[PDB]
Amino acid sequence: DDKELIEYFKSQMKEDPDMASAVAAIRTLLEFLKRDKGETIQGLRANLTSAIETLCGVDSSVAVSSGGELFLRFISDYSKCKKIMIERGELFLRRISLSRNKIADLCHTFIKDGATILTHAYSRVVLRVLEAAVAAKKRFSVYVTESQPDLSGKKMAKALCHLNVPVTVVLDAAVGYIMEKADLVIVGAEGVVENGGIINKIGTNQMAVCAKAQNKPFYVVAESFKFVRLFPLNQQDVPDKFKYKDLKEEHPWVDYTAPSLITLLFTDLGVLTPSAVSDELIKLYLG
Amino acid sequence: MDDKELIEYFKSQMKEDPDMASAVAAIRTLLEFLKRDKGETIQGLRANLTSAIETLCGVDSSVAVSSGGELFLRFISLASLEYSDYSKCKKIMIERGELFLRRISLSRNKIADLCHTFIKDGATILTHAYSRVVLRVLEAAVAAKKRFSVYVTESQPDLSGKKMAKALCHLNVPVTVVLDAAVGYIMEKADLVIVGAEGVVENGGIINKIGTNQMAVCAKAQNKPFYVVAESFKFVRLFPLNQQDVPDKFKYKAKEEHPWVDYTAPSLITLLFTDLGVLTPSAVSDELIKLYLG
Ligand SMILES: O=P(O)(O)OC[C@H]1O[C@H](O)[C@@H](O)[C@@H](O)[C@@H]1O
Ligand SMILES: O=P(O)(O)OC[C@H]1O[C@H](O)[C@@H](O)[C@@H](O)[C@@H]1O
């Protein structure tokens, strides 16, 4: 049922925080598929399409939608069928579970010794990369935006001081001021779109614009289940459902960064240029 | 007066008149030092005027205080020529001082007239933090019955922008407040950007509340006009080429680095609206040089 379909999901996220919202949903979809007491290939298919959607309502991050779409895609005689569906699904889950590791290996080599890295907000993938640089005995320092409204940035600084890397938290407003001190920018993303750009915490776009104006490379680190079937041209093309996950106050939770503002993306599919994403997205979705 | 003498006065001057420019607050305090100074020698006076200026900059790091001071002191220090008795100078210095104070009393309005042209109707304007000059430029637009909308950042860490939004709301001007982090996100929705300045430096760049550089750089990438409204007394004798060149004096009012102002290069500025006329950044040096020489 939905209500403890949701509680399973939320519970899977509450007990492991550093678990991606997507992967949490896949396990909730996997477990749902297991407990499904139906008797029709047909009613199973529907109820899964109802479960994925029910999950997308409670947490409307773009990655739980795209990851959900990809996992259900990968799942392609009810007694028989059901079983191997679960085995394909558990194979798919097994693969996206090494994604963070392969990214760490890939990206951390682009960090020169004595580099000072500028990042935005909290990214579990960025932190795994920087952890891998510490593992590789590389010495570096970090600037991170405090990142209103939830102040994820201090969460990242505190995590980063536990590995004894010098980290300084700056105001969101000070990114233009601090850009000259950085040698490169690394950020994560909630979603990677078809044109090679990204959807990430509000403030990413302006960091990328200030980075291009001082010719500082701008690197993105994201798993391939974040590849989403969208092609934005402006900020209004990002669907409002992923944007909120006479005085007034607008407050979007993420903005969009165009491919022209992005140097490379480091992914479990390999190092990519923004223009190259489209060919890799096709291969990813058809497979 | 003495040191806590000036500080108490100066702090009180702005305490009761919030809209009063900080530099003007210093000029009045400095004037009151000339009126209350009972010394009886010329350069001992001047020399101690050069200590009140420095003692004042200690409590308010705004770079306008230093610039406005030096221009007033340099302007009144022309009294010594052809006024030998220390009591003759003093009298005409006070005179020249209140003359000076009266000129800059006209600076905000002279600006709000020069800039009402560039606010076309139906315009969407973006600004940063709270600027009394910006506020008066818009007051003049609404006064001329012109229709326009505003976006403004909240501007950490004091949320000055929520106070700028409060005022424009009282003008029934449609306004919206966004996060400092959303300026890149919101730029496309704006037709032009207008900010104030704490200081206009010798290359036509500005020193202004932290977050101004961000906005300027994002405005250039979308080809949006970036207009600066600033009084002629904010012209400071500094030539910063980057953020490091901004002296620590004015950068902090006092690991987490929290500067209060950044530098915005002339490359990033379309026009400056000052009480000396509408200037391109490149025309600010020669204008500044004249101002400090006459
Ligand atoms: O890299 P992660 O942790 O998966 O999340 C990626 C992104 O999620 C959110 O949008 C924010 O927290 C960003 O800071 C982060 O980059
Ligand atoms: O326009 P004014 O009142 O001179 O303000 C000068 C400046 O003061 C501070 O630096 C900030 O509040 C800025 O927003 C403002 O531009």
Residue numbers in the entry:
A (entry chain A): 2 to 77, 85 to 253, 265 to 306
B (entry chain C): 1 to 254, 267 to 306
The authors write:
Eukaryotic translation initiation factor 2B (eIF2B) is the decameric guanine nucleotide exchange factor (GEF) for the GTPase eukaryotic translation initiation factor 2 (eIF2). Upon delivery of the initiator Met-tRNAi to the site of translation initiation, bound GTP is hydrolyzed and eIF2 is released from the scanning ribosome. eIF2B catalyzes GDP-GTP exchange on eIF2, enabling rebinding of Met-tRNAi to allow for a new cycle of mRNA translation initiation. Two catalytic subcomplexes, each comprised of a γ and ε subunit, decorate the central regulatory core, which is a heterohexamer composed of two α, β and δ subunits. Curiously, the eIF2B regulatory core is related to an ancient family of homo-hexameric sugar phosphate-metabolizing enzymes, with conservation observed between eIF2Bα/β/δ and the archaeal ribose-1,5-bisphosphate isomerase (RBPI).
To confirm that the binding mode for F6P is shared with other sugar phosphates, we determined the 2.7 Å crystal structure of eIF2Bα bound to M6P. Comparison of the F6P and M6P structures revealed a metabolite recognition mechanism employing the same residues in the eIF2Bα pocket. Slight differences in bonding due to the larger size of the M6P sugar could account for the difference in affinity between F6P and M6P. By contrast, the affinity of eIF2Bα for the F6P isomer mannose-6-phosphate (M6P) was considerably weaker, with Kd = 282 ± 35 μM. To identify potential changes in protein conformation upon sugar phosphate binding, we performed pairwise comparisons of eIF2B-F6P and eIF2Bα-M6P with the reported structures of apo eIF2B (PDB 7D4622) and eIF2Bα (PDB 3ECS27). eIF2Bα-M6P aligned to apo eIF2Bα with r.m.s.d. = 0.44 Å, indicating high overall similarity. Curiously, the metabolite binding site in the apo structure is occupied by SO4 molecules from the crystallization buffer. The free eIF2Bα structures also align with eIF2Bα in the context of the holoenzyme (with or without F6P) with r.m.s.d. < 0.9 Å, and interdomain orientations are not significantly changed.
